[PDB]
Design a binder for this molecule. Structure first.
Ligand SMILES: CSC[C@H]1O[C@@H](n2cnc3c(N)ncnc32)[C@H](O)[C@@H]1O
Length: 270
């Protein structure tokens, strides 16, 4: 079972336009939260732009597919920008997708603050295309230690099978962000840690399915896809993305890498 991975440098809408309906199982989405100067030629706000790829994202997702959207809740009101709430409010009015979960990524370290509570969180909005979305909870359960696992086993009030499988990790994930010394770092300023992406890939996609990321950034999605046995399509508008993607590979089982949007199909084949 060899997996295929395609990558390229191009705009997110050009990527989405080349993918057929219901062909992707999971989309990893960590988008820019501000439009470009030139975007003022056709839009008057952030959602005017974002709604285009949000609609395409839903179109390419299969009936059992999902999209995980990273974002914060600190939008300051600047024209042309927004946050995760801007997207959620838009989705509530115009999309039939279901918000399966609003996950809180609670990281340990951060900047200090004297005039407010120091920020230690980022959100992940998990939208499912339909009520029949795929979910592999057991693949992400957190096991109990032998001592606790034995303590619950003796409690006949509890189902032993549930004890054996582990606990639901909940919708609050306490995971560290990458540090300036991390081995995963490739140079991208907002690089996401593999651990967070791994949990999303394991729980929201099945082995051999396609994971898509059109704001690929560091290319961490491809590295995780490969390690987890999924196929992937990763694109980014920045030329430097190719360099990052190649670096992710060095960090790395049968898989094939293919460059070029003309080859997206290689990663869509089941
Ligand atoms: C994961 S950080 C967000 C990423 O989105 C990329 N990006 C910004 N605007 C676009 C766009 N219109 N199409 C594709 N990628 C984009 C940026 O280059 C960055 O690496």
């Amino acid at each position: 079972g060899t997996t295929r991975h395609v990558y390229d440098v191009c705009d997110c809408l050009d990527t989405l336009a080349k993918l057929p309906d219901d062909s992707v199982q999971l989309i990893i989405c960590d988008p820019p939260y501000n439009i470009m100067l030139a975007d003022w030629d056709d839009h008057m706000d952030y959602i005017g732009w974002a709604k285009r790829w949000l609609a395409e994202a839903e179109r390419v997702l299969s009936p059992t597919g999902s999209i995980a959207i990273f974002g914060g809740l600190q939008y300051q009101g600047e024209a042309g920008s927004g946050d995760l709430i801007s997207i959620i409010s838009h989705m509530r009015q115009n999309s039939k997708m279901l918000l399966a979960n609003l996950i809180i990524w609670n990281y340990p370290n951060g900047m200090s603050a004297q005039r407010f509570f120091a920020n230690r969180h980022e959100e992940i909005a998990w939208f499912a295309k339909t009520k029949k979305y795929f979910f592999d909870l057991d693949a992400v359960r957190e096991p109990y230690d032998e001592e606790t696992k034995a303590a619950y086993m003796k409690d006949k009030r509890l189902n032993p099978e549930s004890v054996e499988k582990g606990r639901n990790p909940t919708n609050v994930w306490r995971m560290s962000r990458l540090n300036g010394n991390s081995l995963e770092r490739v140079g991208h300023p907002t690089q996401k840690p593999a651990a967070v992406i791994e949990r999303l890939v394991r729980a929201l996609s099945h082995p051999g399915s396609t994971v898509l990321d059109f704001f690929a950034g560091s290319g961490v999605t491809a590295r995780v896809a490969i390690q987890e046995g999924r196929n992937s399509i990763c694109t980014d508008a920045a030329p430097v993305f190719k360099e990052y993607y190649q670096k992710q590979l060095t960090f790395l089982r049968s898989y094939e890498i293919v460059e070029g949007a003309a080859n997206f199909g290689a990663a869509l084949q089941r």
